[PDB]
Amino acid sequence: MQTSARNQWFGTITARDHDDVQQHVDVLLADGKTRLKVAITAQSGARLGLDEGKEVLILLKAPWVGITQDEAVAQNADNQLPGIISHIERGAEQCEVLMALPDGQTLCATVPVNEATSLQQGQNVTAYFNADSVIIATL
Amino acid sequence: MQTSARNQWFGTITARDHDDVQQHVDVLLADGKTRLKVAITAQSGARLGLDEGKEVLILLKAPWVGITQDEAVAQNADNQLPGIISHIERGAEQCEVLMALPDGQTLCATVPVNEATSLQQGQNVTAYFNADSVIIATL
Numbered sequence: 001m002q003t004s005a006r007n008q009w010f011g012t013i014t015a016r017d018h019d020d021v022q023q024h025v026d027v028l029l030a031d032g033k034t035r036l037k038v039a040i041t042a043q044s045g046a047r048l049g050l051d052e053g054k055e056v057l058i059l060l061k062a063p064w065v066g067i068t069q070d071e072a073v074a075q076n077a078d079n080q081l082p083g084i085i086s087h088i089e090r091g092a093e094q095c096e097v098l099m100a101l102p103d104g105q106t107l108c109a110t111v112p113v114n115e116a117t118s119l120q121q122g123q124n125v126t127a128y129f130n131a132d133s134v135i136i137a138t139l
Numbered sequence: 140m141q142t143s144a145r146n147q148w149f150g151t152i153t154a155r156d157h158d159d160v161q162q163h164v165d166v167l168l169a170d171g172k173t174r175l176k177v178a179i180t181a182q183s184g185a186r187l188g189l190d191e192g193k194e195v196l197i198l199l200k201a202p203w204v205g206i207t208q209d210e211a212v213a214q215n216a217d218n219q220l221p222g223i224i225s226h227i228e229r230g231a232e233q234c235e236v237l238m239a240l241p242d243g244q245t246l247c248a249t250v251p252v253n254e255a256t257s258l259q260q261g262q263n264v265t266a267y268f269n270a271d272s273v274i275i276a277t278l
C-alpha cells in the first residue's frame with residue numbers, strides 16, 4: 001500500500017446496512033468526530049468484513065472532492081468536510097486545492113481550472129463528495 | 140492489496156506525462172493488450188514513481204463503471220472496454236452488471252436501475268470510465 005489517492009484516512013465502521021446489491025456503511029474518522037457515508041457492493045461488504053468495529057482506510061481520489069461555499073450544495077452531498085483553503089496551485093486545465101481540516105490533516109482536491117477561479121487561499125469552504133466516490137481498504 | 144474496489148487489475152505503466160497539477164499515465168494491463176488512461180496528481184506521480192515499466196494495480200470501483208450500448212457514449216469517455224454481459228443482478232435502486240472481458244476476467248459495474256432497463260445477459264456492450272476515475276496502487 002501506497003496509492004495515488006491523495007486523501008487516505010483511518011476510520012472505524014459504526015454501521016452497515018444489508019441491501020443485496022449495494023450497501024452503505026457509516027465510518028467514524030481518526031478525530032473521533034467526523035462521520036462519513038460510503039457505498040460498496042454487497043459482495044465487498046461481506047468479503048472485507050465491514051461490520052461495526054472494523055478498522056479501515058478511506059481512499060478518496062482528489063478529483064472526487066468538490067469545493068463549495070453554499071450550505072445547500074454541501075448538505076445535499078453525502079459527505080461534507082468544512083475547513084480553510086491553505087494553498088492553491090493553478091495549472092493549465094486543473095488546479096490543486098489544499099484545505100486544512102481541524103484534523104491537522106490536509107485534504108487535497110483537483111478542481112477544473114475554470115471552476116476554481118473564484119477559489120482562493122484563506123477562504124472558509126466545505127469539501128464534499130458522494131458515498132460512492134470512496135474506496136474502503138483493509139490494512 | 141485488499142480494497143472494496145470490485146475491479147482490481149494488475150498492469151504496467153507505459154508512459155507518464157509531466158503536466159504540473161494533474162498528469163496522465165498510460166497503463167498496459169496484465170492481459171498484455173488492454174490499454175488504460177489514468178489521471179493522477181503530479182505529487183502522486185512522483186511519490187509512487189509512476190514511470191515506464193513500473194508495475195501497478197488499477198483500482199476501479201464498481202459505480203465508476205458505466206455500461207453502454209451507445210458507441211458515442213463509449214467513445215466520449217477516456218477508456219472503453221467492449222465485452223459481453225454475463226450476468227445482471229437487479230436491486231431496488233442499483234444493479235450489478237457483470238461483463239466478460241475478452242481475456243476472461245469479469246468486470247463489475249454498479250448501475251442505477253433506470254440505466255440498466257435495456258441491458259440483458261449475452262449482449263454486446265461497452266464498459267467506460269474516465270481517466271480521473273481510477274486509482275493507481277503500488278504492490
Ligand code: NI
Pocket residue numbers: 156157158161162163
Ligand atoms: Ni497530460
